[PDB]
Amino acid sequence: GQRQLLLASENPQQFMDYFSEEFRNDFLELLRRRFGTKRVHNNIVYNEYISHREHIHMNATQWETLTDFTKWLGREGLCKVDETPKGWYIQYIDRDPETIRRQLELEKKKK
């Protein structure tokens, strides 16, 4: 019971305040500027999102499946969700469209 190592790098359902804020702030902004409102797969948006500073995996959340992240994010009025034989596809909600179109066109000139 000695040579177990352990390391202590567990418990992702308690860092939902930090990881859901850093993941939904950059993911919901990246989803809004780079995509607009499109039916697109969240793992394509996640793998797109983490190529920047923000390198988080879905597994860092309190959502044990992507389905539960789609159950939570879909619930806030930010995303619309559907399931196919090829995955989990989300169509995002165009919030304030002048924010969506200013993300899309203008925010590209500075960031």
Q: 21 forms bridges with which residues in the sheet?
A: none
* Sheet hosting strand 39-41, strand order edge to edge: 39-41, 87-92, 79-84
Domain boundaries, the chain: 11-111
DSSP state of 11: -
Structural biology method used: NMR
Measured distance between the N- and C-terminal CA atoms of the chain, rounded to whole angstroms:
52
The type of residue at 20 is S
How far apart are alpha carbons 83 and 75 in whole angstroms? 16
Degrees to nearest 5, angle at CA 102 with 40 and 35 = 10
DSSP-derived 3-state class of residue 95: coil
The count of C-alpha atoms lying within 13 angstroms of the C-alpha of 105, restricted to the half-sphere facing its C-beta, is 6
The type of residue at 25 is N
Of 50, 62, 73, give the one whose Cα is nearest residue 12: 62
How many CB atoms neighbour CB 38 within 10 A? 12
Of 104, 111, 105, 110, give the one whose Cα is nearest residue 34: 104
CATH number attached to the domain at 11-111: 1.10.10.2030
The type of residue at 83 is E
Residue 40 and residue 89 in contact, taking contact as beta carbons nearer than 8 Å = yes
